[PDB]
């Protein structure tokens, strides 16, 4: 068996970015599934996360500045967020004061 790369066969632009990353020596170090999360994200609405990458919202802790998503974790999840978009924030209190 050989790697059926990009210049070796007609490709499909549905698993484009997933497969190009799978054919790397860094592939065994992504402990999170990359395909089951993307093939189902295509069908569901926009995710609950920062307009930029998922590694841009910090841990809401007492004293912080902790951003876990980095080069040591390897869980980056970009999503196409428009210019005019509003995040569903949850009120720290009674719901009706939102």
């Amino acid at each position: 068996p050989y790697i059926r790369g990009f210049g070796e066969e007609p490709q499909e632009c549905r698993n484009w970015g997933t497969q190009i990353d799978l054919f790397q020596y860094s592939a065994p170090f992504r402990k999170v599934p990359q395909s089951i999360t993307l093939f189902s994200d295509y069908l569901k609405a926009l995710p609950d996360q920062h307009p930029y990458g998922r590694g841009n919202d910090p841990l809401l802790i007492q004293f912080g500045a902790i951003f876990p998503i980095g080069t040591k974790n390897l869980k980056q999840n970009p999503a196409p967020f428009g210019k005019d978009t509003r995040r569903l924030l949850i009120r720290r209190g009674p719901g009706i004061y939102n």
Partner: protein, 161 residues
């Protein structure tokens, strides 16, 4: 968000063209429907309280979700549910005026299914309350406007499932 008008302007602007008789036919088709959308949006605004009142009584009023132990039990949570139904009825009116469900993707369904899963809100009963609110509003605005309004009530339901 974008309405039907800015959809034509944005599609013709990406190509760089000025305008054409083909996309002008799309604009003229929207103006033909514009007065229908306006009278229906005014009726919904004046009857916003009684649509939610008649939709809650039909769907979820004397059920387990209002008794102790279910979501919607306390007054803190009964008032939150009524407020959510006024979200869907007020944002589905924006999509009915704009003729474009784009606003429901940006400010309504944007991460709404995980928000309910973290709070514990029953997703199945929320769909049944939006469906019940669909026939109630479809009787006020009529069949022509109500059929177009229900196109976005269904959009919220498929985006919430």
């Amino acid at each position: 968000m974008q309405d039907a008008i800015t959809s034509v302007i944005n599609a013709a602007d990406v190509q760089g063209k000025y305008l054409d008789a083909n996309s002008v036919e799309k604009l003229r088709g929207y103006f033909q429907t514009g007065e229908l959308r306006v009278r229906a949006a005014a009726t919904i605004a004046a009857n916003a309280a009684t649509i939610i009142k008649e939709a809650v009584a039909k769907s979820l009023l004397y059920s387990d979700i209002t008794r102790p132990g279910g979501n919607m039990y306390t007054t803190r949570r009964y008032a939150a549910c009524i407020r959510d139904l006024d979200y869907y009825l007020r944002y589905a009116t924006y999509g009915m005026l704009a003729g474009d469900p784009s606003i429901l993707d940006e400010r309504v369904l944007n991460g709404l299914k995980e928000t309910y899963n973290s709070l514990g809100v029953p997703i199945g009963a929320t769909i049944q309350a939006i469906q019940a609110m669909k026939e109630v509003t479809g009787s006020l605005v009529g069949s022509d406007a109500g059929k177009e309004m229900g196109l976005y009530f269904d959009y919220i339901c498929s985006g919430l499932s």
